């Protein structure tokens, strides 16, 4: 048992936080003691405040926090079975959420590999990718493109993927893998762009293993949106210089951009696919790469035999079972009109931000709002100002922004962009 | 779905850890249960009880649905299934971290969360290459292992493995080049460690860490070595200004016979990784300590911080119940728990010695392992064992066991007689 303050006294001496140091913390974290539903928790002034968690506790809580059916989901797995390897057992858990991973996901994505993390599907994904084109007898194609302004993870591999200025790449010098890297995408669709990212591949192309992009939405690396056609031309691109198209939809998957997965804004589908975040709605760790059959059996066939990979958590029926009841509740329900009107929440509840002197874009894109600023956002100063508005928010650069649960009522989407806007405004004062 | 329905799903669509799609040996067997010791499979569509002589991969220390960790993860999930770790910290956190700094070895002082084994490494690897571009001295990023190593399945992770286990044949050109010592042997030898110094002595400059498995090495040979040798690296690793990794995710938590294997040596490494056993077996989780030092300089450099933060960085559900874990563990007189289990799985594999296709009998704590003079076959070991209620996971040529602490008397006697039979079968042809 520990108060806040000496959960605070622990946490400064002990522990570390996301891109954090030890004992030179600007601001203390703020001490969480709930979670419920689109609301949490927190400790101000040694009072107990509930904010709003507009940041879907970095996008995971689609469903909200303690979601009954989802809480329920997880306490009847709890009384059956925990947890058993999944080297040379399997269990419903893992078969009734594969069988619907496959049968919502882009067409072809047949065959899921569970994981406890982002990164690590990332780096499954990688491998995936490697080990196909070993299986094809080309081990030369073995570097990685994209384009800038990406994020895929934490992991050395994933690192060397990200965006070099968000990924701090000069600090990694000599260490990380050099991968190729196309321009910034655009918002808006220029075939040109097109046209230069498919010439920069052509003469990297055999030494490619795969292009691995965020879809429509870029999230770590800057929440920047671009047009779902570069998807399809980037599906074209792959498909005629014989490189592998991975999606990585950790950030984007189920229902966040308005589609079920933001490949469908495109029709196209990737060869291989990354999710994760939402993928539990916010309870538990778990991951999923899915590959087409082709890739599925082109690496079963090769020198290898299998994927060689295998967390020790693989398929929990926990986070397995949670999934299941998660990704069951989101297509009960018509989901696409919740994000319509999320997205037209978002986009009115930002509007008056467009005027603000500070201000460079407004952007909307499903459950996704974003304003833009024309310097760093003062996070000392932004934090609080959120919270005394009932929100928890956290801004980076120059980026105010949220993706709220879809559970979120129209009264707390207001309430949620105003909030937002009022960040914005002391940017600018 | 009905075992017959899950094995149809499972074989068209689940990867399993080190598998292929479709060119799978034997089915994975169903499990539909998990309690105690036991899980319940599916056996010729019939439900039969079986020990669980893996503890499902190291994980399950207290058996499976245990009413204390149960318990304690209701009644987190009760109030908050999780918040994000970017500005917001927690009791789970705070009370984990606490535990873990004060019963891993002196000098670990601070504590980073993450979802999985392998990320921990990562994060480790990360924290020394920051530790010495912290020093000015960023040519100091390459890392010394000794061969028969694991660490992980994502690629830094992998560049540490046993370069053979790892199949870094598989990976040329991709993996980072790592320095490796020769395999460490039982028995300590003075001759063993003067070669490792000789050999560090030459990389010096360009090494940022020594990373091992402290006393027991797991999945690269279930090999055993003298706790002397970790004095040995201790020294070294100081006198050459090159940082300490004791990766424990496989020996924590009582699994040798110590809390922690370094304690059978004294010796506190500068950064360690636990995992495995850390949540009694029931979520994915790990985490990578290290010390004030390292922190410190980490944050005074460059960066300013640690540049890692996982989505579920330490999700209160995960660190809930490994508070209880820990707790459960240190209230008891766990270490005559372990010896017991020792004694009984010394005495119950000492009639193997004898069998014609033994090589070695070996025990530490409650790890037990019969090696074979060939690789186990798993089409006849399987089977044979469930004959004999028990589920055992052989792999390359060793039968081994690392039951869970609860095991009785006779259990650990009905798990030994069954690895015996196996034994017995792999040289009976
Ligand atoms: C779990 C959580 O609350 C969290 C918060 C911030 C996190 N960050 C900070 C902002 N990030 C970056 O600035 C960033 C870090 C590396 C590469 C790129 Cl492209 C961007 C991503 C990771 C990660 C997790
Ligand atoms: C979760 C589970 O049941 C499981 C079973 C086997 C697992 N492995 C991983 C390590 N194994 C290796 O052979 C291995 C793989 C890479 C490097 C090294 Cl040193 C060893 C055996 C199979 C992993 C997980
Ligand atoms: C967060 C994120 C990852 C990494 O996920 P973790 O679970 O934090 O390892 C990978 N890709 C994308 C697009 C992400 O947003
Ligand atoms: C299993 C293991 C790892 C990797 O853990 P995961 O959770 O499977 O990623 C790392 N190190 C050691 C010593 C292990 O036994």
Redesign the pocket.
């Known amino acids: 048992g520990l108060t806040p303050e000496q959960i605070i006294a622990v946490d400064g001496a002990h522990l570390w936080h996301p891109y954090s140091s030890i004992g030179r913390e600007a601001v203390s974290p703020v001490v969480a003691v709930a979670a419920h539903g689109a609301w949490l928790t927190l400790i101000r002034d040694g009072q107990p405040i509930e904010v709003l968690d507009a940041m879907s506790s970095?996008?995971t809580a689609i469903h909200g926090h303690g979601h009954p059916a989802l809480d329920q989901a997880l306490t009847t797995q709890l009384r059956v079975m925990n947890h058993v390897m999944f080297g040379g057992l399997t269990h419903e858990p893992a078969a009734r959420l594969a069988k619907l991973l496959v049968d919502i996901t882009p067409a072809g994505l047949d065959t899921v590999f569970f994981s406890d993390?982002?990164?690590?599907?990332?780096e499954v994904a990688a491998k995936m990718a490697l080990q196909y084109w070993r299986g094809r007898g080309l081990p030369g194609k073995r570097r990685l493109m994209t384009w800038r302004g990406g994020?895929?993870?934490?992991?050395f591999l994933?690192m060397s993927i990200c965006d070099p200025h968000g990924g701090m790449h000069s600090l990694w010098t000599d260490v990380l893998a050099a991968q190729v890297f196309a321009p910034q995408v655009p918002r808006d669709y220029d075939p040109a762009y097109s046209a230069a990212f498919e010439a920069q591949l052509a003469q990297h192309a055999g030494e490619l293993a795969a292009v691995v992009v965020?879809p429509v939405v870029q999230?770590?690396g800057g929440m920047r949106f671009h047009d779902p056609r570069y998807l399809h031309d980037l599906r074209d691109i792959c498909r005629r210089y014989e490189v592998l198209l991975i999606f990585?939809?950790?950030?984007?998957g189920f229902g966040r951009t308005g589609a079920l997965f933001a490949a469908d804004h495109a029709g196209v589908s990737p060869d291989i696919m990354?999710v994760?975040?939402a993928l539990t709605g916010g309870y538990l760790?778990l991951?999923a790469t899915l590959c087409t059959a082709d890739v599925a059996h082109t690496i079963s066939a090769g020198a290898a035999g299998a994927l060689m990979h295998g967390p020790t958590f693989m398929a929990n029926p926990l986070a397995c079972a949670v999934s299941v009841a998660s990704v069951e509740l989101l297509l009960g329900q018509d989901w696409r009109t919740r994000i319509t009107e999320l997205a037209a929440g978002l986009t009115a509840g930002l509007d008056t931000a467009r005027a603000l002197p500070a201000v460079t874009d407004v952007r909307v894109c499903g459950a996704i709002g974003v304003i833009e600023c024309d310097r760093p956002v003062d996070l000392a100063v932004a934090t609080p100002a959120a919270l005394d508005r009932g929100v928890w928010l956290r801004p980076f650069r120059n980026l105010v922004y949220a993706m709220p649960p879809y559970i979120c009522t129209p009264a707390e989407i207001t309430q949620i962009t105003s909030a937002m806007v009022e960040v914005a405004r002391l940017v600018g004062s």
Not at 151 to 155: L, P
Not at 248 to 252: F, G, H, K, S
């Open positions: 970095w996008w993390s982002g990164s690590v599907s990332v994020y895929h993870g934490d992991t994933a965020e999230g770590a990585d939809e950790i950030a984007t990354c994760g975040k760790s991951a």
